[PDB]
Amino acid sequence: ANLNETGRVLAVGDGIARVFGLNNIQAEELVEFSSGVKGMALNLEPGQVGIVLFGSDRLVKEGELVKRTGNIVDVPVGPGLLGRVVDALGNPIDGKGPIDAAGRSRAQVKAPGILPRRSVHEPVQTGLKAVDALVPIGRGQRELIIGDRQTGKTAVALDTILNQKRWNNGSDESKKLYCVYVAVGQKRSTVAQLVQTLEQHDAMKYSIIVAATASEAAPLQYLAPFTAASIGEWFRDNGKHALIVYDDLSKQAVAYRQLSLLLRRPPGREAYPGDVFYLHSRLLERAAKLSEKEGSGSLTALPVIETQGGDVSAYIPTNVISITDGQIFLEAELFYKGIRPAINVGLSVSRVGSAAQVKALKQVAGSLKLFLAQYREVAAFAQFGSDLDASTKQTLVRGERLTQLLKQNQYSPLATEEQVPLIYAGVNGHLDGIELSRIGEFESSFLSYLKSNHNELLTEIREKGELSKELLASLKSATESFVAT
């Protein structure tokens, strides 16, 4: 009966437990009960203490024994997690034997200071043309993936992982980009099948999976993002680059509002607590580009938010947008018209893209984003059937060609070198003359023309990554000649 490291359960319910004792316990310190269930001292009061339950309250009985861990909740971090599927605690759930961790890190880490940071400048090829052209992602950026149910939110994050294989199998390190997928509030089958696809594409070797199924208690889903974050932070400090994707943060807040409401906290907008902002805030901040003194490491994050009826004006969504460095909205309408990925250039944004985009794309794609923005305004304004002038009509013909060119099938990542050529033609107008139903076949036929003929241009844009004043001319004469035939 040592009321200094152990206490007795006074009451239990609603997923909270009030234990009596533990006078030497730290705030937010991991604990364990007689049943073996892990808890956490979320609050400390005189004469009692509040503990959250990471398991079913069934296992917690009133009057049991409660021992403390003596360390805050932490998760195994290291290179040995690669190819291995764990939960919120860091324990293996795949059954390939215990995890080989190099160390243990707190579940709640503070974001790097302002001084130990640098602006992002390292492009991160996602494989998607419409993406790495309008709203590119760089090492240390926080690109949001907002969209409604079944719109292709993960389809953009998933293809990114498979495209990294092109550098993960290389000798150089600064080129490789580790991946850490986070699944919270999802189904068992949904994740299992997701893992299988990774193995088929042999991408699981360089990817870590953290699980927080819906069946699992809410808190697990709450701590899953934070812990999973620390797993990738390791690569950052070692001078390596990591990439973590939350799927999805919107469910988390729902899981957290649960414990929030259970602990009796004044409801806010949409029944979310006022501190819901600090939730996603503290999580995203831990993704940036460190200075050279730190190790020149980075941590790119891809949070996912699910909206209702294409409402980006919702609460949860806006809170995330006021943190992330750009969004990639996925309207359902465009998704049904075949336009996939259904990227809505209107709401899509990149706060640090050009800074971390290949110069070869910056040149060929100039004012393409703003044009498309104004495109939908005149396009949806001429869809009435009324006759327009030559000025609006001319912009209406070129807009349609670009829109169809942005389209791309899934599991079909294209090299930057392959993307540069396509954009060039769109802006110039060579496609305008081309029929609308031939835009698709044209792309596959145009790429073969360069490989079979002007291969030299492809090899130049690959290494150099910039279009000189000379290569610009050799390219024009090479496309114009193809448009004619």
């Binding site: 309250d57 069934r58 009133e62 089958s189």
Partner: protein
């Protein structure tokens, strides 16, 4: 020996507070019993108020209780008998028979509260589950161990579409079925049971194929929110023991969320958005996750869905759809055209309708069928105004093509043999794909439209065309 006793200290509605002995309080979610003149009262543990006092939810009426009465502890969560003995038997949330057919002589008794199967036990590939309906296997196929949404109330033969899936699977996969009714109308529950004896899905003298577990509406929220788990348990038995492709029917998943909302309401828990319970998110998973395909067997869920105020933004529906894999809609306008079942090809969609799942052939075949019907829906205007002659050689062709495909969708229900008198048929996915594939190519344009109505098989289609033509001569 091990007799646990306590005393009721508080009675507030369906919420009763019992006091047990120090360091002897039963855990949570357990089953407490109280003596009642009728039979017995059941109390499910919920919280430990403290001071050797626990709060439970009533599974029946609470009128009559008096502060002091003894309260027995079973020691374990509510239990329901499992085995082939439940087939053809009406079981309530408590697990006791109410069909007046005596006690269910079972060998084992599993609890309603079970942990969701592990990650490692999960499958790494989704497969299609052959039902027995062309409108299904071709358009919106059922996912093996997935969740299917059934829309449309009475008038579309909902009941008829249910007993069907129970028969087919019983003959193709030989897996039993489990029907679960949450807040089921006592009226409908009666007519259902009786109808099931008339169709043959349930035989008293012979062998039943489906187990019934109804949860009347006149029951307290406590019982309502557990009915589903009761039926789930029985189904998991035939999944892990006999390893069968059992089907779990839930009607309606909506009242299951409502049930929770009333329970969490009385407990004092603060109301979330729209009024629903905060715990809603976790509860939904403590039922959907348990329904999956394991290495031993599999459980396919066929649960109806109700859209609150025709709004899909609402939490309850929003949350439900997050687990649904397919949806079989039943429109009135479909049964109005004499098309049975009243399944709507346009609304019925599946998350397993890809070439990487059903194959490239199956995919293209299904896609063309939808394309043919889609363009036909838009022509239903210029045709009824300016005649049908207002179509090109390519348009008028597809139009006459759709007329055959839409009718060909129909299929005689083997369960409704005593209703119609016409022999039912069981179409397999192997023949289904080959059927429409030959219609699209245009190999039956000389064949009358009436030759595709209520046809069991493509081979039978021609068998009927020859008879009709012979009768004309």
């Amino acid at each position: 020996s091990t007799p646990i006793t306590g005393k009721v200290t508080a009675v507030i509605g369906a919420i009763v507070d019992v006091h047990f002995e120090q360091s002897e309080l039963p855990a949570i979610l357990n089953a407490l019993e109280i003596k009642t003149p009728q039979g017995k009262l059941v109390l499910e543990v919920a919280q430990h108020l403290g001071e050797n006092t626990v709060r439970t939810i009533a599974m029946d009426g609470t009128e009559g209780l008096v502060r002091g009465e003894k309260v027995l502890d079973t020691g374990g969560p509510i239990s329901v008998p499992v085995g082939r003995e439940t087939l053809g038997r009406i079981i309530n949330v408590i697990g006791e028979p109410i069909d007046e057919r005596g006690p269910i002589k079972s060998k084992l008794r599993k609890p309603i509260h079970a942990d969701p199967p592990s990650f490692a036990e999960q499958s790494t590939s989704a497969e299609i589950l052959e039902t027995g309906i062309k409108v299904v296997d071709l358009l919106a196929p059922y996912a093996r161990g997935g969740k299917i949404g059934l829309f449309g109330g009475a008038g579309v033969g909902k009941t008829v579409f249910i007993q069907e899936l129970i028969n087919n699977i019983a003959k193709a996969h030989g897996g039993f079925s489990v029907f679960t009714g949450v807040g089921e109308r006592t009226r409908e529950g009666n007519d259902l049971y009786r109808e099931m004896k008339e169709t043959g899905v349930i035989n008293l003298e012979g062998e039943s194929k489906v187990a019934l577990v109804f949860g009347q509406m006149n029951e307290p929220p406590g019982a309502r929110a557990r009915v589903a788990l009761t039926g789930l348990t029985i189904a998991e038995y035939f999944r892990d023991e006999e390893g069968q492709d059992v089907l779990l029917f839930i009607d309606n998943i909506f009242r299951f969320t409502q049930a929770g909302s009333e329970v969490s309401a009385l407990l004092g828990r603060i109301p979330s958005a729209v009024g629903y319970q905060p715990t809603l998110a976790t509860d939904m998973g403590l039922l959907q996750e348990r329904i999956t395909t394991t290495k031993k067997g599999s459980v396919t869920s066929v649960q109806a869905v109700y859209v609150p105020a025709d709004d899909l933004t609402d939490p309850a529906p929003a949350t439900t759809f997050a687990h649904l894999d397919a949806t079989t809609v039943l429109s009135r306008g479909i049964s109005e055209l004499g098309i049975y079942p009243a399944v709507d090809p346009l609304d019925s969609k599946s998350r397993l309708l890809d070439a990487a799942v059903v194959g490239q052939e199956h995919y293209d075949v299904a896609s063309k069928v939808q394309e043919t019907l889609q363009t036909y829906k838009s022509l239903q205007d210029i045709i009824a105004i300016l005649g049908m002659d207002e179509l090109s050689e390519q348009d008028k062709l597809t139009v006459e093509r759709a007329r055959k495909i839409q009718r060909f969708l129909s299929q005689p229900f083997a369960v409704a043999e005593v209703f119609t008198g016409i022999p039912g048929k069981l179409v397999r996915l192997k023949d289904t794909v080959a059927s429409f594939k030959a219609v699209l190519e245009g190999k039956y344009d000389n064949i009358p439209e009436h030759a595709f109505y209520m046809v069991g098989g493509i081979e039978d289609v021609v068998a009927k065309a020859e008879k009709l033509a012979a009768e004309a001569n």
